Symmetry: D2
């Protein structure tokens, strides 16, 4: 039961930046790595695909690709001079497109494809071709501004897909929940004065962009109350995210009445990610997906699209991504998470949990969110 579309294309795994040691450009005092290049490597997303295959999950999904984003679709958010600058740099072996936004040769075409998968996933779910969808969109989108590449993002994938969906289906209320561990600054900025898109970011306080918390950035004018930042304390794990979901996200969704929920799903909150300091395990991602699927079922006829964003642990992202897809599809594979029990033991102690919970209660009050129970 439940029909889940899995939007995937092998060519998304061929995007590759020049030499980097994690996030640091090679050059100067940064030695080229012998093996592992840029943090946003193909391997993180590849290993997820490979585990879906060997576990039997891929066979139970509707595996689909899609055409690349048209220039028309891209131009709804990005200017033509940005497209031209990107293509030119892409045609000259790659280089630096923005702040922490290195591209490689042919990255332009691959970024168009990534955007296209997101466009197509929202389309398929709005058209009723599937109940929900997972789009393995690499390179990612959540940090990209209209006029500026950043945080490994070159097009604003989700915003492009939403604008295309509005043009084609006339959906009026879309909620974007971004549980990537970093702040979804691209989605926030694009929809900041808009009430047709509710953007919620759970992120590690001050991680990326560095030093940004944003609790008081709730949107402006027409968009006031339709952006919500939940800056979680570094070191939090399962309980911190469960409390955020229950006290902030679910109430915010209840009030907004989404016709479609899009999840910007990074897995970089996992307990072994190099690019954040949070302590999630695969069952945390499973539980967040269960809660958002339920919200989608109550508000949006089940219409839910999960778009892959970050996740930089080659070893562990596969197990987290697999838990999300199992929950979307309602299929339980024989896969057992070999780090689950270990990560359980590393969780914050009761005093730390109490401290974070109290902050979240205060934040819910500050946002004016009523603690109601779910209903039809």
């Amino acid at each position: 039961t439940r029909r889940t579309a899995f939007f995937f294309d092998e060519l998304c795994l061929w995007h590759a930046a020049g030499p980097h040691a994690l996030t640091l450009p090679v050059g100067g005092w940064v030695q080229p790595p012998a093996a592992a290049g840029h943090a946003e490597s193909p391997e993180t997303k590849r290993r997820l695909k490979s585990l879906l295959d060997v576990s039997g999950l891929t066979a139970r999904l509707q595996l689909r690709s899609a055409p690349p984003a048209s220039d028309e679709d891209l131009l709804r958010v990005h200017p033509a001079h940005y497209l031209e600058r990107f293509k030119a740099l892409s045609d000259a072996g790659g280089g630096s497109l923005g702040q922490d936004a290195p591209i490689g040769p042919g990255s332009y075409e691959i970024a168009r494809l990534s955007a296209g998968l997101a466009i197509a996933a929202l389309d398929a779910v709005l058209a009723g071709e599937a109940d929900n969808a997972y789009s393995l969109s690499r390179p990612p989108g959540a940090h990209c501004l209209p006029d500026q590449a950043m945080g490994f993002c070159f097009f604003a994938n989700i915003a492009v897909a939403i604008e295309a969906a509005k043009a084609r289906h006339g959906v009026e209320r879309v909620a974007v929940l971004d549980w990537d561990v970093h702040h979804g600054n691209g989605t926030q900025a694009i929809y900041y004065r808009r009430d047709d898109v509710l953007s919620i970011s759970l992120h590690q306080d001050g991680c990326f962009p560095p030093g940004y918390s944003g609790a008081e950035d709730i949107g402006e004018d027409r968009g006031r109350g339709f952006n919500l930042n939940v800056p979680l304390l570094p070191g939090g794990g399962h309980d911190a995210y469960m409390q955020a979901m229950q006290r902030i996200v679910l109430p915010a969704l209840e009030r907004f009445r989404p016709q479609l929920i899009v999840v910007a799903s990074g897995f970089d909150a996992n307990a072994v990610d190099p690019l954040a300091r949070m302590q999630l395990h695969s069952d945390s991602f499973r539980a967040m997906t269960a809660m958002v699927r339920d919200a989608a079922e109550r508000h949006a006829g089940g219409r839910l699209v999960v778009v892959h964003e970050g996740g930089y642990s080659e070893a562990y992202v596969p197990f987290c991504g697999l838990a999300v897809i199992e929950e979307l599809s309602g299929v339980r594979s024989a896969v057992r998470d070999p780090l689950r029990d270990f990560i359980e033991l590393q969780q914050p102690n009761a005093a730390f949990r109490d401290f974070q919970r109290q902050r979240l209660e205060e934040l819910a009050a500050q946002f004016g969110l009523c603690p109601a129970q779910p209903l039809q």
Copy 2:
């Protein structure tokens, strides 16, 4: 410009486990990595050495190697059957020597060399051949128990070094400060009932061994009050460690009056390490080294040895290790940490810092350090 001995052997970088994805052994659901093997890779330690060379710092250090640890030295802490067991598995091409303790072909002889470098570094500093020393001892030592390999450690390098030092030189009070992000359980266990060795561990609360905090474990009988665990909240960074150093570590060292300070220096509290959740930058490790070098100058005649332990960020461990060595030597290279400013902006907010600070005040009071 002090005299710093740098103990290093290229062959320590040749120890390699079987296929792993981070800490997970390949097999079952864990696919073999296309490139990046076990977390405890040669590359983290090699890249420190490479940056030490390209910066020119190596030319300002006293470069040394050492013989492998003798059976005599190893046998002060490990039984003969452990050595036998280890060697057999090593000669057979490797495998699992214990819990999270995989070994590869020849890992036995390489582990003996790692231990030997630790032995030699303490010796050189105690003999007056250098003011202080850094030992690039891979594989690491601080989790290894007398008859149980664990946490990627196969001999208890520091314990072996200390027992060897005591036999040869007759040093009476040694302080071991372990700022590796994980609990120094091996050092703690070996010296738990002893007052001639003060063991202090700074670690992420519950990280490794998983779920272990340990604030209440202060030693027993003769050792009571000569073990200190400071379980820091996950997510803490520079201020949390500076507060732990000022409130607990330095007062503890003052009270103990060590004649030698050994640091179990893991860099895995760095802000981009996969194996912990702490937020240190290179200047944090610089600052901790300055604080401990000062304690060593006050009580130990400058006698400080830093033994390299963990650190699993290939990109960032080199900058942190270099900061330590710059501080030990008193030489500042041209190297500039390209992540430092970024990491400063990611630090805990004031409320989180205050929360951790109050916790450290209470722990300092529990330890009788007020």
Copy 3:
């Protein structure tokens, strides 16, 4: 546009040996690689599959998997104690199953799957489910003897496939053409005294097994004249292989009238392979496949199965394997081989070509093919 079945299982790409530098086991003087492990890596086979997907060719093929080979199937060629021995070493985390035959954790079950894909590919073609087939059977099979793993091969995939086919379908004459650059010693040995299987090996003279040429080894008793070795001079390329195909292989197949042709298709004769010294490009493999598909259409009702064997250039095997599959399917993708023109310019000069040609004329005459 013919009907081509592509047998593939992602799990075949999860077999991985312990640490090796190319073919050398790590240990002693061979330092662990910073990234690039054993020559028989997942990446060569994975990159073929990735290019098949990005080219869109996969959408024009009949994609299939298979059950692992049963004990019954394996036991037609291998003894139970071999299976036991293999499994024990696999469950223990791997090691050396034979001479140049390292295995990793779970390699036993993965080798059974590799064999299963070969069994299924022959079955599908014999049952009329496809006109022809390609099996991405990793680990490979052509060097494995009944009770001796060697040359990175742990079961004799093709022999197991053939024996299974004979039991189920009752095919009487099978031709095995092995254009892997190394000698197909396992296939040769198993069928040496048999006339129901014609084994032909094209290989680099003396490459692997090292020093073996074998022109004189034509089979014995009932098998006499049903084994042909063509030991090509190292350094030969396209013309050497085209001459071997026209003068020896095609006449041999004509004489034998196979009812099924199986190709042991290694790509290790490619011009940038580390494990041989030959100079083939993707159009050479395209041409050899066209020639054998034609022989199969003439005698075997089109029944041709290509089993993937060697190929150790990550960069270039994908283009060569794609050319084969394009030829089998009759579909031409948009893919253009970026090394082809370069390799054409590197070919043997006319004097070297003439030298090799005269050698092949004489060998053809020795074989009674004039």
Copy 4:
């Protein structure tokens, strides 16, 4: 006995091109590699250094670095606009400097250092600071033209070093023996009309540059008879090289009377190299080094410099490089070549050897070389 200078700098191992699969630029149909990048990787040269260290050889050599090449030194062969174009591309994250000549960020400074090590090695040997020298000059030099980067080479290291040595010491007769498996086209072109430099290339017929043999290219006018190409048949190994050394190289050296011998020492003729089809083992390189050391001792007061060029087998180049340095230093380590015996068995058969030998006899006759025996 014998004092061997080993010119090395760790920073030479930090030169790294953008993503390549062997020699193929990533992009289009060439997928980015998961691990191993460009063929000219740091690892080949690093593993040689590591083996020198663990074997005890490094401790028995005079380990030295040197300043980078000055613009003055570079300008003796390269134009200022070439230096400027290189630096600009190097400062912008790298890219393509020529045909099969990709550079990375900071490659300019590292290439200057590589040239500087070569300059310094010739200087040290001409000054009598050591009997002979080995320079681990990465990136390599032998393919670089004055006006054009190629074959992974960005400065003409050996030519730069020779021109500097002539300016500083006034050496009049330098022989460059290039046993890298590819044609030393840079050295050939620069000295093609010169009789003060004898350039000899042993190379696989038609390998790199592709299709070039060059037996009839013997130099012109003043340089006629002071360039010699020995195009060996692909597939040849130990005997083919021994015959070439005995029938061509030694006689050519005898006639020329070098005051200094420089060896452009690539190890890409090794039996497992991806970038050529030849079958040398470490004892082949040992024997070639012994013969050239002897020639240097008879003609040049022992003055011999070996400059690292190619070699693309991570596994095997270390054992070959180690054999050369053992022979230069006269120190025999405990290292045993684990592929030696295997490669012995793969050698060409007697008919193939006879075919190549006869070609070499005919070539010696064509060059007008008399088969004399060595003497003082």
